[PDB]
Each structure stands twice: as structure tokens, then as C-alpha cells.
Amino acid sequence: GPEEITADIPNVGEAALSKLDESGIVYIGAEVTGGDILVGKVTPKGETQL
């Protein structure tokens, strides 16, 4: 399937989703360090086979 830039990220707290706008892109002027999510991206992988 097509990948999404959406702000909806599987398994992240509000501290993580804080720095992203509704669309999933980090705000201008926001100071960041390693591990902060700059751009939320999600790619389809179905039936994880656990």
C-alpha cells in the first residue's frame, strides 16, 4: 500500500506526538534532540505472523 505522512503513529506517547502538527510534521522553531520525531511516517505491513 501507499505510505502516509500522517501524525498517527503506532505506539507513541503524547510527548512524542507533541512536537508534530495535525499532519505529522514538526513545527518550525521547535528545538530537537536525537530520537524526537521530525516527520511521522507509516508503511503498511499486514498479518504480522506472531
Partner: protein, 50 residues
Amino acid sequence: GVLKIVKVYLAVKRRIQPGDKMAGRHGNKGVISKINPIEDMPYDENGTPV
């Protein structure tokens, strides 16, 4: 294959730390070893440190 691209531009500010390379224009290289306090600095009779 690429639907959309998001380019974020970071501005990082680093000053100086041990391991950095410094040199004069005369071919004299060097690496900062330790960062010494103004207290321990050799000073002239005027009191101006180096």
C-alpha cells in the same frame, strides 16, 4: 514510487570540545586536550589571563 517528500532543516549549534582540530596558518596542527578554567590559566602581572 515516491508519493511525497518532507525535508526538515535543522540548525545545530556546537562550540568547541576536546578532540576538535585547531591550527594556525603556518602548518602547525593540534587537538584541544582539556578545557581549563580561567582560574588555572597563566596570567601576567596585569592580571590578564591567556
